[PDB]
Write a protein that binds this DNA or RNA. Structure first.
Lengths: 83, 95, 97, 75, 109, 95, 109, 83, 97
DNA sequence: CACTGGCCGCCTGGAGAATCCCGGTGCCGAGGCCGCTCAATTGGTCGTAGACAGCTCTAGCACCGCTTAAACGCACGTACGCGCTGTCCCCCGCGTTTTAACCGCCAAGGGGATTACTCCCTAGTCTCCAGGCACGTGTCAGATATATACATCCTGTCATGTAAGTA
DNA sequence: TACTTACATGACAGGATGTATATATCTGACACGTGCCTGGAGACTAGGGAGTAATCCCCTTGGCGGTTAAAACGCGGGGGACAGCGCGTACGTGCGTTTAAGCGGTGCTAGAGCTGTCTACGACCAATTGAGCGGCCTCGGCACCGGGATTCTCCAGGCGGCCAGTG
C-alpha cells in the first residue's frame, strides 16, 4: 500500500517512444531522469489541481472530469473525456 | 433505473451524413466532437458575456456573438460563419 | 555476417511508426502507480477512475510530445540533433514554466 | 625552463606518424602526457604550429593554419 | 385549440438545436438576458464549424480509404488547416497522435 | 459634477498607511493597483464561478473561493491567504 | 428605532470593501446566488495580496531612497518575488520597465 | 489623409533601445525589418479586435479600455489603464 | 587621440540604463501614425484617444521586450550573443504564435 | 647545449569620462479638506439550495495464474557534439549634418456622454407534445492472420582518382 | 621527376528484410428500431433594457513657429559568427534474458450517485444614512540644474616568457 520509487516506472524506452512520437532522432542519456522530473512536476501541478477539485467535490476518487478540467485551466485543453 | 446524460450525438451524426452520405464515425471521434462543440460554445459564450459586460449591456444578441466570432474565429472562417449566421437569422426572422 | 542497420534509420522507422500509429506509449500500470504515488503525497487515501488514469496518460504523453517538439526545434536551432538538458530548460523557460 | 616547445611539437608528431596528420587536440594531450602546462600556453602552441608550418619542416594535411591535421615532411 | 409545435432548428433550417443552445446559454450564466437571434447565430456557427471539420475528416478518411472517421483522422484534419490550427493551437485530441511532421534536417542525405 | 467613477483609491491608501507610515503613492501606481485588484478579482471570481458550475452549484461561498485560491495562488501565498481568509470569516461570523 | 449603520469590512476587521466586492460578484454575473462569507474571504485575499505587494513596494522605495511608490517600485516588487512572478507572468506593469537582469554570457570577463 | 509607410516610423534606434530594455547585447542587421513586420502582425491581431470592440460599441473613437481588453484577451494583460 | 570605447561596453551601459530607466522607447507621434495606418486598413477615418495610443505603445514595447527576452535566451542557447531572425522565429514558434 | 639580447604576450599605473553623490530651487502632483450623493446597510419576508441521511449498485481495488513483450543489460560500433582555430564580414560607436518630434499655442468641431422618451423583446408560466437518449440487438468493417511483392538499406564489386613507392 | 601501383572513394548491382499489398474471418463496435419522458415549445403577459432624439463640451483633430534631440549616414574597427576537422565519447542498434506488464477470472467493497427532508441562507424591498468620490488648494518631495569624487574603462609604459642569435 506504500509507494516509494514509482518515478522509475516510466521506463527509459517509454521516454524513447514519447520522443519518437514527438519526432526525435537522438536522445541523450541525461534526458530520461530530468524528463521524469519535468513530468513529475507537471503531474504535481495537474494532480494538485485535481485533488483540490476532488476535495472541493467531497468525493474520494479522482475522476476524468477533474483531470480534463485541471488541464483545461492551464491552457492544456484535452478532448475526448466528456468535456 | 438510470439518469439521462446529454450529448451532441444526433446533430453531429446528421451533419456527417449530410456532408458525406457514405462515411461513418467511431465512438471516440464522437466524444471528441462532443468536447469540441462544448469548448467552442463555452469560448463564444464567455467572450459574448465579456462584450456584454464591457459596454454595460445585460442582453446577448446575435450582434454580440457576431462580434465574438469575429474576435475568435481567424480569417476566412469568420466571414463564412458570418454568412451562415446571417442566413440563419434571416430564415428565423422570416419565419 | 549478420545484418545490422546503421545508427538512425531504426529511429526514423520508429518516427514513422509512432507518428503514423496512435496508441499509448507509457506502460499503463507503472504510470498508474506513479500517479497514485504522487496523489498519495497530497491528500491521503485516493482512488482513481480508470478513465482518469488514461486521461492523465493521454495528457502526459501529449505534453511530453509538445516538449519534445520544442526541444527538437531547440536542438536544430543549436545545429544539433541530439537534445540536451538545456534544451528542455529553454523550452520550459520560453513557454514560461 | 627546459627546451622550447618546438622540439615538443616535433616529438609529438613523430611519436605516432599514422596515416593522416595529427590534430591539435592529440598533440596537446601528447604534450600533457610528456608534461607541460598547456592551459596558459594555447597561443604558444598556435604560434609554434604556424611557425613550424611556415618553415616547411611541417606540412599540414587537410586543415588550415593551426587547425586540422599536421604530418611530417618528405625527409 | 393550439398550434402544432415546430422547432426553431427547423425554422432556421439548421440541424443544431436552437432550443438546447439557448438553454445552455441561459444556464451557463453569461448574461441576465439573451436575445432570440443569438442562439440561432451561435448554432449556425457551430454547425458550420462541425460541417467543415467533418468534411476534412471524411476526406482524410477516404484518403486513408476508411469509411469511418477516427480520432487519428481528426488530428490529421485539424493540423492540416492553418485556421483550424489557429483555433485549436493549445487543444489536445485524445488518441489521435500527431500530424506526421519530420524536420528537414532529420531526413537522411 | 459628473457620474462618479468608482475606484479602490482610499482603500489601498489605508493599506499603505497601515503597512508603511512614511511611504507615499503615485497616481499611476494607484492606477496599477486598480488594475491589480480588478485583475485578481476577475481571475478568482471567474474560476470560482466555473467551480460553482462544475458541481452544479447555484451558490458561490467561501469554500469555492478558498479552493480557487488553492488553484490560482501558489504555495505559501495560497496557504497564508487561506489563513487570513479564515480569520476574516471567523471575525465576520462573530461580528 | 433603526440600528447604527456599521460596515462589514470593520465587522470583519478589514479595509477592503466587503460590500463592493459582494456587489461586483452580483453584477459580474458569476452565479445566481453568492454565499455571505465569499465576499469577506475575497476581500481578505485581495487585502493580503495588496498588503504584501505594497510592503515590498515601500521596501523597494526605501531601498531607492524615495518616499513615494512609483510604478518602477511595483515592477521591481513583482519580479523579485518568484511566487508573485508566477502569479503575474503574463501581466505587464505600465511604466514599470523590466527587472534588471543580464545573462552572464553577455557580461565581460 | 492616406498613410502609406509608417513601418519605417518605428526607427532602427527605437528597435535598438527596445532590445536594450530586452537585455539584448547585440542585434543583427536583419532584425529590424522583421521586428517591424512582427510588430505589424501583433498590431493586426490587437487593433482588428480593438476596432471590432469599437463598432461593437458603435463608437468612432478608439478608447484605451478597448486596447486593454484586446491585450488581455490575448493573455498579454496590461496594467495601468483600466477604469 | 580622441577617446574611444570598445564595442558592447556602451551597449552594456545602455542595457543597465534601460532596465534602470522606465520611460517609453518608441516615439509617440510616429507610433500614432502607425496605429492610424493600421486602423484605416480596417475602418477608415478612425479617431484615437491619446491614452489609447499610449496604451498601445506600452503594450507594443512590452510585447517586443518580452520577445527579445525570449530571443536573447534563444541566442545564448545557440552559443551566440547576437540575435538572428531564426532566433525570433524560434521564440515566436515555441511561444505558440 | 648553455648563455643571452631583442621581440611579443601580459601586468600595472594613470588619465579621462560616465555616473554617483552632494547641494539649491522652483513646481506641480500628493495629500488634505469640504460638499455631496449614492451605495452600503438593516430588518422583515419568502422562497429555495444544498447539507444530511440513507439505500443501492457498480466499478475500483486486490489477488492469482499464465504468458509472452518488452525492459534490461552488454557489446560493437559510428556518428555527433564540440573544442579549437582561421577567416571573413557585420554591426556598434562616434562624429557631423539633417530633420521632424516635442512643445506650446490656438481654432474648431465630432462625437462621447448624458438625459429623456418610448416600445421591442424577452423571460416567466401553464399546458402540451414530440425528439433524442437508454436499451437492445444484429451484423459487416476492420483487426488479425496469412501469403506476396517491392523498397531500401546495407553490402559487395567495378572503375577511377590519387597518394605513395620507386628508378 | 616521371613511372608504376595499391588504397580510398564514387558508381552500380544485389540480397534481406521491413514495409507495402492481397485475401479470409469473425467479432464486437457501430448502427438501427423501441419506449419514453423530459425538454422543447406556443400563447400571453408584465415589464424592462435598449434604441433613438437632442445637446454640449471637451476632447480630439487640425495648423504654425521654434528647439533641438533624435535620426541618418559614413568611417572605422574590433568581435562575432561560423566553416572545418579530428576526437572521443555516448547513445544506437542487435541479441539473449527477467520479469513484470498484460490478459483473463473472482471477490469485496467503498464510494458514487440518486432520492426524501428540511432548514439555514441568501436574495429582495422600503427607508436611511455616512463613507467614498469630485473638486480645490496648498507645499514640499521631487524634478531639474550645477558642481565635485568615484568607479570604470582603456591605453602607455613596463615586465616576463620566449624566440632567435651566439659561442
Amino acid at each position: 500500500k506504500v509507494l516509494r520509487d514509482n518515478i522509475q516506472g516510466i521506463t527509459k524506452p517509454a521516454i524513447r517512444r514519447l520522443a519518437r512520437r514527438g519526432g526525435v532522432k537522438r536522445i541523450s542519456g541525461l534526458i530520461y531522469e530530468e524528463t521524469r522530473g519535468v513530468l513529475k512536476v507537471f503531474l504535481e501541478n495537474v494532480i494538485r489541481d485535481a485533488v483540490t477539485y476532488t476535495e472541493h467535490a467531497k468525493r474520494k476518487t479522482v475522476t476524468a472530469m477533474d483531470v480534463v478540467y485541471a488541464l483545461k485551466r492551464q491552457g492544456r485543453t484535452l478532448y475526448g473525456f466528456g468535456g | 433505473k438510470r439518469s439521462r446524460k446529454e450529448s451532441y450525438s444526433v446533430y453531429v451524426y446528421k451533419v456527417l451524413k449530410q456532408v458525406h452520405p457514405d462515411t461513418g464515425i467511431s465512438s471516440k471521434a464522437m466524444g471528441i466532437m462532443n468536447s469540441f462543440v462544448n469548448d467552442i460554445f463555452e469560448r463564444i459564450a464567455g467572450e459574448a458575456s465579456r462584450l456584454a459586460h464591457y459596454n454595460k449591456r445585460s442582453t446577448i444578441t446575435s450582434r454580440e456573438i457576431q462580434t465574438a466570432v469575429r474576435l475568435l474565429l481567424p480569417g476566412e472562417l469568420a466571414k463564412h460563419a458570418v454568412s451562415e449566421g446571417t442566413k440563419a437569422v434571416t430564415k428565423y426572422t422570416s419565419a | 555476417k549478420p545484418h545490422r542497420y546503421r545508427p538512425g534509420t531504426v529511429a526514423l522507422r520508429e518516427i514513422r511508426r509512432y507518428q503514423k500509429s496512435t496508441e499509448l506509449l507509457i506502460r499503463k500500470l507503472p504510470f498508474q502507480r506513479l500517479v497514485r504515488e504522487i496523489a498519495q503525497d497530497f491528500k491521503t487515501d485516493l482512488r482513481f477512475q480508470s478513465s482518469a488514469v488514461m486521461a492523465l496518460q493521454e495528457a502526459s504523453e501529449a505534453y511530453l510530445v509538445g516538449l519534445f517538439e520544442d526541444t527538437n526545434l531547440a536542438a536544430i536551432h543549436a545545429k544539433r540533433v541530439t537534445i540536451m538538458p538545456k534544451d528542455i530548460q529553454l523550452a520550459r523557460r520560453i513557454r514560461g514554466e | 625552463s627546459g627546451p622550447p616547445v618546438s622540439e615538443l611539437i616535433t616529438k609529438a608528431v613523430a611519436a605516432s606518424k599514422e596515416r593522416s596528420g595529427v590534430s591539435l587536440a592529440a598533440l596537446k594531450k601528447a604534450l600533457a602526457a610528456a608534461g607541460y602546462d598547456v592551459e596558459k600556453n594555447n597561443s604558444r602552441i598556435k604560434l609554434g604550429l604556424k611557425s613550424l608550418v611556415s618553415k616547411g619542416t611541417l606540412v599540414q594535411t587537410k586543415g588550415t593554419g593551426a587547425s586540422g591535421s599536421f604530418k611530417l615532411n618528405k625527409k | 385549440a393550439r398550434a402544432k409545435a415546430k422547432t426553431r432548428s427547423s425554422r432556421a433550417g439548421l440541424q443544431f438545436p436552437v432550443g438546447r443552445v439557448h438553454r445552455l446559454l441561459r444556464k451557463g450564466n453569461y448574461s441576465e438576458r439573451v436575445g432570440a437571434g443569438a442562439p440561432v447565430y451561435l448554432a449556425a456557427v457551430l454547425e458550420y464549424l462541425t460541417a467543415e471539420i467533418l468534411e476534412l475528416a471524411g476526406n482524410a478518411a477516404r484518403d486513408n480509404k476508411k469509411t469511418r472517421i477516427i480520432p487519428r483522422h481528426l488530428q490529421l484534419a485539424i493540423r492540416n488547416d492553418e485556421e483550424l490550427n489557429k483555433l485549436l493551437g493549445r487543444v489536445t485530441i485524445a488518441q489521435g497522435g500527431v500530424l506526421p511532421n519530420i524536420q528537414a534536417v532529420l531526413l537522411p542525405k
